[PDB]
Nucleic acid binder design. Structure first.
Length: 76
DNA sequence: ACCCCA
């Protein structure tokens, strides 16, 4: 029933997930219940690790993709 | 674009 899932993301996408002052990722952690770790520093690729029961992981993933979708094509 | 918490 508990898993660890790792997402490989570009830095621009991590900016969208984390949000201003971390307000987005703090919301995703609190609402999903997943433990969510994001690798540090402005590297071209970043790793997001989701841990928890599979329903916590699924909700965190849904939130993350919904945030990326809202922010698609938003910076150039 | 957003940079969290460890």
């Amino acid at each position: 029933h508990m898993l660890t899932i790792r997402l490989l993301m570009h830095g621009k996408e991590v900016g969208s997930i984390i949000g201003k002052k971390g307000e987005s990722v703090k919301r995703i952690r609190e609402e999903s219940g997943a433990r969510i770790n994001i690798s540090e520093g402005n590297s071209p690729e970043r790793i997001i690790t989701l841990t928890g029961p599979t329903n916590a992981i699924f909700k965190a993933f849904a939130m993350i993709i919904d945030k990326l979708e809202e922010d698609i094509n938003s910076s150039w």
